[PDB]
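Record format v2
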Amino acid sequence: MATSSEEVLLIVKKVRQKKQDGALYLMAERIAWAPEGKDRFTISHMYADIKCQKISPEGKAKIQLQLVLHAGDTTNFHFSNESTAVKERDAVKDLLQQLLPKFKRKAN
Amino acid sequence: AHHLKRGATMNEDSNEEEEESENDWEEVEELSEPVLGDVRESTAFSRS
């Protein structure tokens, strides 16, 4: 329970970064993403370093979530999961923004 | 209208960094619970 453990709170499927196939896994204090069907993670950010996140609303050909890090970084996550794309988008949004100020390491 | 990113062929090979609507997100911010006292269970100790 938020004890530096790899406890995946939210398992998001078919997530693409810049159209790259993958899966988004929300752990206790870190959010990681790895290509779908691959065992090697490529994206790993701590909630501590993330300041906020923006979500690309309907009207686009792809529903997405961009992570705005207070370190000057941004991660565009396209929810290409036809099954729960929009649904996962908001669930991830909420969970992330809820944990965002809880692990805030910007107090430095 | 057209997508404000891909003006011509640049990375339509791997389809990575060429086009994306990254200038249209409902910007979500760090949301915290309105609390003015972290003692709701500790106070229910009843007795020692």
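Chain B touches chain A at residues 15-17, 20-22, 24-33 (CB under 8 Å).
The two ends of chain B are 69 Å apart (CA to CA).
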